[PDB]
């Protein structure tokens, strides 16, 4: 695409500059260009890809929630008819959001996942695939909603199976995956008990493994454990 003429290393360098400038749309475009060079990504490069798109889609999701709330209020009894504008604009933001999700899913399918053989890369990409199907599920209201939900579930499940066999229970990718799959269960799959069980079990197994860690790894793992605890406190 438009990044085909720029060196891979320059795209990476510019992605890091865009991050410092909080220019996440640019950061994502640079990282897409880097992926499209066709080489596998290092750990740092995978993190840059993930940060960039999570920030872009995070802004779109927050805007979609604002607009969806306004639209829902407009459809309550006693609300004045204001025309098609709220629906139209929510749909515009929704279509943009879906486009970003499709872009990320396309990078994962062509060809990040198939080339990823180490547990740390494969689990990371499968988690991403689950996340972007989950974001599609957040806005899905039609006949493919069940299939979108099952695509998220299937990607998360494969990531969980690999992470349990190949990673320690304190590994940050394993922990972040479990956090997100637990959110999937709670608010996408209508399975709050599964969400709570997964969070509590993940937390307890990580706690039992902290003794093996250096001080820096302990800080990394406990940070994510606190997110699991935050959700357990909210949900129980």
């Amino acid at each position: 695409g438009a990044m085909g003429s720029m060196e891979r290393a320059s795209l990476i360098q510019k992605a890091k500059l865009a991050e410092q400038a909080e220019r996440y749309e640019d950061m994502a475009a640079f990282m897409k260009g880097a992926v499209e060079k066709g080489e596998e990504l290092s750990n740092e490069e995978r993190n840059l890809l993930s940060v960039a798109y999570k920030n872009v889609v995070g802004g779109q999701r927050a805007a979609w929630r604002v607009l969806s709330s306004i639209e829902q209020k407009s459809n309550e009894e006693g609300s004045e008819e204001k025309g098609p504008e709220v629906r139209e604009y929510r749909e515009k933001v929704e279509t943009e959001l879906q486009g970003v999700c499709d872009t990320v899913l396309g990078l994962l399918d062509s060809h990040l996942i198939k080339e990823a053989g180490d547990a740390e890369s494969r689990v990371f990409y499968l988690k991403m695939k689950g996340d972007y199907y989950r974001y599609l599920a957040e806005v899905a209201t039609g006949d493919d909603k069940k299939r979108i939900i099952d695509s998220a579930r299937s990607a998360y499940q494969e990531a969980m199976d690999i992470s349990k066999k190949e990673m320690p229970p304190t590994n940050p990718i394993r922990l972040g995956l479990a956090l997100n799959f637990s959110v999937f269960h709670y608010e996408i799959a209508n399975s709050p008990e599964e969400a709570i069980s997964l969070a509590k079990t993940t937390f307890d197994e990580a706690m039992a493994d902290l003794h093996t860690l250096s001080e820096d790894s302990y800080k990394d793992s406990t940070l994510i454990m606190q997110l699991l605890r935050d959700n357990l406190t909210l949900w129980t």
Binding site: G58, L177, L179, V183, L234
Partner: peptide, 8 residues
């Protein structure tokens, strides 16, 4: 209080 997902 919005639930946490894996975000910085």
């Amino acid at each position: 209080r919005r639930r946490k997902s894996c975000q910085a």
